[PDB]
């Protein structure tokens, strides 16, 4: 089964230039039936196609990306990498590399098989700052809280990844400081308080930060 | 030219057949496909070639259409279903994607489990303290929150996020966060979250002291 994998730097500062790697997994990147292209999200906006090569180098872009987007592929390496020149506060978005199938007596037919995880790109001057987990100690509620953190995303888990029904991880909200702030809860039975343990496993790659905060009553 | 998709929303409750538009800039020249985005995650494509549809994606999903118009038809909607739909279309050297169908689930009104949490002993000994109001599985998405120190309203020092959509019940999750410097939260005792929901018979209020 094919997997694609981004790897970017999640924060680029302005007029600067943004690079994202894709590492394709399961499957050769020099296969004749399939393109490998780059698709972007803007916050509550809907899907851009930048660009897409195939695995000789035959590259193909979006007329108003064409003038900045330049997308190359290592078959060596197994992957393919998109570089966008002279980056702005507008291209603020979710990049997402996605596995393009072509089959075709006349010419190919296209549909993106697969599709890769997301890097949340932010554009800004501002600096790195990791996070700071706070318990929310108490059916009973209980959770964290992920404060003063930049730039996005944080991914947060609960006795790692074991607890799943019931958690509800809440948008990030920027405050006035510029720094974005989160908060994860889960309710549980108030019987399991004493007995079983809870642990939030917040992690922050931008920044690489990875926090295990012990969630106690009282 | 012009890639329109319609509707732009739509709410519908479980159980319900519900068909979506979408029109392509041109006459169909390559594959017309149909994507699945549930929120965070990245797209999902169930049609494909207008018709068909990729091994492993449920019977309920269908799709047909010719020349400029389409359209995208699930047969018995399900809570995991809820989505922003999307319609892709390869024409000129260009894939271009449509506007996008947010659709959402209509439910029985439910009541919130509202939670209110103090501020941290650590986070008061670093100079500042954040106090939340949890609002726990409600529909519909429309509720207030006011915040009352010592029976005081309070504006503009808190902020709130609400969930996306669950795909099990079905409902919002609500979560506001009312910060205050260390030494203004000694000041006061009494820390409130008022609770205002259409599915509230009377405006549920909790609180807490020191």
């Known amino acids: 089964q094919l997997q694609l994998q981004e790897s970017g730097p999640g924060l680029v500062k302005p007029s600067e230039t943004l690079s994202l790697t894709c590492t394709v997994s399961?499957?050769?990147?020099?296969?004749?039936?399939?393109?490998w292209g780059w698709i972007r999200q803007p916050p509550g906006k809907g899907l851009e196609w930048i660009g897409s090569?195939?695995?000789?180098?035959?590259?193909s872009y979006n007329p108003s990306l064409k003038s900045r987007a330049t997308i190359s592929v290592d078959t060596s390496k197994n992957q393919f990498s998109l570089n966008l020149d002279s980056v702005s506060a507008a291209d603020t978005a979710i990049y997402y590399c996605?596995?393009?199938?072509?089959?075709?007596?006349?010419?190919?037919?296209?549909?993106?098989?697969?599709w890769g995880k997301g890097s949340t790109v932010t554009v800004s001057s501002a600096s790195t700052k990791g996070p700071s987990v706070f318990p929310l100690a108490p059916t009973a509620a209980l959770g964290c809280l992920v404060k003063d953190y930049f730039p996005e995303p944080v991914t947060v888990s609960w006795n790692s990844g074991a607890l799943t029904s019931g958690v509800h991880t809440f948008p990030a909200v920027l405050q006035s400081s510029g720094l974005y702030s989160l908060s994860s809860v889960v309710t549980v039975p108030s019987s399991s308080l004493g007995t079983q343990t809870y642990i939030c496993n917040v992690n922050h790659k931008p920044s690489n930060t990875k926090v295990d905060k012990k969630v106690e009553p009282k | 030219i012009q890639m329109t998709q319609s509707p732009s929303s739509l709410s519908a409750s479980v159980g319900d057949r519900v068909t979506i538009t979408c029109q392509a800039s041109?006459?169909?020249?390559?594959?017309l496909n149909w994507y699945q985005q549930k929120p965070g995650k990245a797209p999902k494509l169930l049609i494909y070639?207008?018709?068909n549809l990729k091994t492993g994606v449920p019977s309920r999903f269908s799709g047909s259409g010719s020349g400029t118009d389409f359209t995208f038809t699930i047969s018995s909607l399900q809570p995991e279903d809820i989505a922003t739909y999307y319609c892709?279309?390869?024409?000129?050297?260009?894939?271009?994607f449509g506007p996008g169908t947010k659709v959402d689930i209509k439910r029985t009104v439910a009541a919130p489990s509202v939670f209110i949490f103090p501020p941290s002993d650590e986070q008061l000994k670093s100079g500042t303290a954040s106090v939340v109001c949890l609002l726990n599985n409600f529909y519909p998405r429309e509720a207030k929150v006011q915040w009352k120190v010592d029976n005081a309203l309070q504006s503009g020092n808190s902020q709130e996020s609400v969930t996306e959509q669950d795909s099990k019940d079905s409902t919002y999750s609500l979560s506001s966060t009312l910060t205050l410097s260390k030494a203004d939260y000694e000041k006061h005792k009494v820390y409130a979250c008022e609770v205002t929901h259409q599915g509230l018979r009377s405006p549920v209020t909790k609180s807490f002291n020191r």
């Open positions: 996605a596995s393009i199938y072509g089959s075709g007596t006349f010419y190919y037919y296209f549909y993106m098989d697969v």
């Open positions: 399961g499957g050769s990147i020099s296969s004749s039936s399939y393109y």
């Open positions: 090569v195939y695995y000789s180098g035959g590259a």
């Open positions: 041109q006459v169909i020249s390559n594959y």
């Open positions: 070639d207008t018709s």
């Open positions: 892709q279309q390869y024409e000129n050297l260009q894939f271009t």
